Amino acid sequence: EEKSKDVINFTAEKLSVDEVSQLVISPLCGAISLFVGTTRNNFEGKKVISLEYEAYLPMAENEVRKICSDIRQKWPVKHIAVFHRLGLVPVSEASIIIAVSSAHRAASLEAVSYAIDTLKAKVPIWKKEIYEE
């Protein structure tokens, strides 16, 4: 018997795809799907050196919990993890990592896609592009 987990974290720290995958590991699961959001080095023509992220944390957390609850109603997932970085996120570093685990791949795949689309659509987190001055 293993209680299912929702691990949600907003943090200024560098996100590690390894540490996050570990959080959703289970012997009852055969699939883990992940999404990693990275700072791309350009936006509409100009060179980007980093992205800066801000949020109203309480609200943001609450919205991520809604997403988790919704996921668990539509799919038989086991563990979910959602990490978002705040502050400056330099090029090629991760601003968001999501991971979901399940018995079979369909659930985890569909869950992760929904998670990322929904988070981008519904969570109060903003970004400012930092260029070269």
Added chain:
Amino acid sequence: EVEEKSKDVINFTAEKLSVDEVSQLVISPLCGAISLFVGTTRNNFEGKKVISLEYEAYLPMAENEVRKICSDIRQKWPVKHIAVFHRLGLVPVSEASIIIAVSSAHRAASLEAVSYAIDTLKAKVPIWKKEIYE
């Protein structure tokens, strides 16, 4: 605006797979999205307890089929790097038998590519799995 040659990294190996090492292979400054799928040995199958899965790959056919998958992906979606690692031999419970990673400018490509990749690999690539019980 440097050119960075796009990569297809395909590997069959008896070694333990690392989700970190595989993600590194598809990293790009031109990409904002990396999607991954990790296949793990589940500890049961139709009632009975499983201790490991054993995988055997018909080669080089299995490589050739993974290359087809990569080519097909690149015809429909604007992905940048693809990586497909499959472990062979005994893969104990909770360890990874397959890690697929795809990167792109934007998330739709990488999400869609990875699902297509895993479904298609399970459908078309000649790898035999035998359940090992207790």
